[PDB]
Amino acid sequence: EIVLTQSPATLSLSPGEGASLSCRASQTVIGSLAWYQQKPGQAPRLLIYGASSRATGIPDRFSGSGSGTDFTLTISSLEPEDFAVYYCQQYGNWPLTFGPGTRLDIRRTVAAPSVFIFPPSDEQLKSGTASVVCLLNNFYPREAKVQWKVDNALQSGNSQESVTEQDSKDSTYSLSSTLTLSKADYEKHKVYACEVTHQGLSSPVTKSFNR
Amino acid sequence: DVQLVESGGGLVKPGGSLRLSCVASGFTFSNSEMHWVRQAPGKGLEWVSVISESGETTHYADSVKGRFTISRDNANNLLLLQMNSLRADDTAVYYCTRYNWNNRVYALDSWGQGVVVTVSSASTKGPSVFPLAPSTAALGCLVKDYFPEPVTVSWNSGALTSGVHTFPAVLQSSGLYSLSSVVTVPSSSLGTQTYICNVNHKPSNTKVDKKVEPK
Amino acid sequence: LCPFGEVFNATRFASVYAWNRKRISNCVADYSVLYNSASFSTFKCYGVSPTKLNFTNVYADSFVIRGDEVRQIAPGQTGKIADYNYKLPDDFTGCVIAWNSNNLDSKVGGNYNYLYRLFRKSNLKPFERDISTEIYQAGSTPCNGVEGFNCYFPLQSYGFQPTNGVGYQPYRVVVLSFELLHAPA
Ligand SMILES: *[C@@H]1O[C@H](CO)[C@@H](O[C@@H]2O[C@H](CO)[C@@H](O)[C@H](O)[C@H]2NC(C)=O)[C@H](O)[C@H]1NC(C)=O
């Protein structure tokens, strides 16, 4: 099975720069190597086949090259519509395989998140469950760390995270982390804290409340 | 114009069966090798199956072989995927696509719009909307424990969009979906301006307008 | 132990018109293990199930065709391969195994080593092997020894390119026949 690896996983570039995306096969590709672009909510769009042949109607700022086990896709000058996910794919060996994809986002100045902590509503507590929500608002880059602390004890296993898509206007990201616990466990503790680590913060930021 | 239109997706319980269909137009279907390719939520592309132009040769990925069957009716420009013994792993958007080698385009040329397939034992349930109260401030709504997708959220019936972030839903351990929608606003407007989140869940005919105010 | 490895895992396979046949005597054979090799696109048995065989002679015929012709390796089937290259009897008792070999029997620019018989005067009898290379006479003119108007060479190349579709990719085929006679085993 031809495992395709794509590097790097993410690429932050400004419009007008060039992009170079790498695909490596675990063994020689004797068939066809293809590159696809995918936007959220749409089908993939074929950009390149045969490692270098551009598909009909594709703008010529897209080009591909390579052979054997190494292939690169080059976008000469980036347009705003070009920020998307890109997949390499091989045909000829079964199963047909895809790369995990490279994500291209817009680069901007560092923005530390605004942190907010939300206790569960009394209405939810009447139902027997508690949700504690931590919001990281309008940060760049996407990489960030969120740690839950209950009565100064780090929590693991009962947290779920969600991230918005990059904002069209300011190119920022927003994150939510939800700590779900039974009402019984929720009333056993007092201090609920959210600790946020991000490149835009010199020291971690903690937002907390008392039950 | 080349077009592939898919149909037949929906909810299915684990162990159930489901038959997906793709109708082709604007090209010679009988001269086209076709594939089904799927994409799980938040994941990449994964190849499922291939059938040759005449239908006499098919190939399958290992995880679906023996459970799925690809087939075609060239007279009716029809491509089919019969999926049996479905499991949670099979939850994905399924795409129909042509491999245009006969026209010297050696790649997945034309794609369908994709159709959602969800494999779950959960039953239809309306969401509960809870307020994330404020104390520039941030307030929001927690839309919890609904099934299936989707849920739509707006603020002040669409009048308020600046600073809104409606997060992608997550699938909780219970099999029910949950989501949060927040908005940052001036702190001065907390007592004067009214903030109402409108949550619509059509599958259960649920419509909730919840006002979010300081506690 | 049966030499099934040197049938299925042979480095090179015969052209279909010159298909290979290996005889199987003595030996102890595990057909369920052969099924469980799990590397087969096609494993169809006629007249017996794989879990029942576990004879005097066993015949293993092997060759290469394109994918869409694998269905022709079946009793009562018709077509170029079934008529001119390899014919199975209607009362066939055995198994037909096929697996895609695009990784082995295909090369960039085309592999033209694998041939098939395009023309013949009559249909092949079951288990008949015709390796004749005489010019086919498609018209009243006696061909003598050259090609031209209604004079063609009887063999054609497959032309296996890696970017071929599944139906036009190389498939390696092994056919097992179980012949029992008034003989030992
Ligand atoms: C062709 O070679 C493969 C690789 O050795 C064989 O697969 C082995 O099969 C035996 C059982 O016969 C197992 O015990 C080994 O674990 C298998 N190894 C691998 C890597 O799969 C295969 O059986 C050979 N073909 C035939 C017809 O025997």
Numbering used by the authors:
A (entry chain L): 1 to 211
B (entry chain H): 1 to 135, 143 to 222
C (entry chain A): 335 to 388, 392 to 522
What's in the article?
Here, we analyzed banked samples from this study to investigate the evolution of the memory B cell response at the monoclonal level over a period of 1.5 years in rhesus macaques receiving the AS03-adjuvanted subunit vaccine. Furthermore, we determined crystal structures of mAbs (25F9, 20A7, and 21B6) and their mode of binding to the RBD of SARS-CoV-2, as well as one structure of 21B6 complexed with the RBD of SARS-CoV-2 BA.2, at resolutions of 3.05, 2.58, 1.75 and 2.30 Å, respectively.
20A7 neutralized all SARS-CoV-2 variants tested as well as SARS-CoV. The crystal structure of 20A7 with wild-type SARS-CoV-2 RBD shows its binding to RBD would clash with ACE2. CDRs H2 and H3 form extensive interactions with the RBD. Comparison of the interactions of 20A7 with wild-type and BA.2 variant showed that the salt bridge formed by 20A7 VH E55 and RBD-R408 was eliminated by the R408S mutation in BA.2, which may contribute to some loss of binding affinity. Remarkably, 20A7 can neutralize all SARS-CoV-2 Omicron variants and SARS-CoV with little to no reduced potency as compared to SARS-CoV-2 WA1. 25F9 and 20A7 neutralized authentic SARS-CoV and several other bat coronaviruses with comparable potency as compared to that against SARS-CoV-2, albeit 20A7 showed some reduction of neutralization against a Pangolin strain. In conclusion, we identified 25F9 and 20A7 as two highly potent and broadly neutralizing antibodies, making them promising prophylactic candidates against sarbecovirus infection.
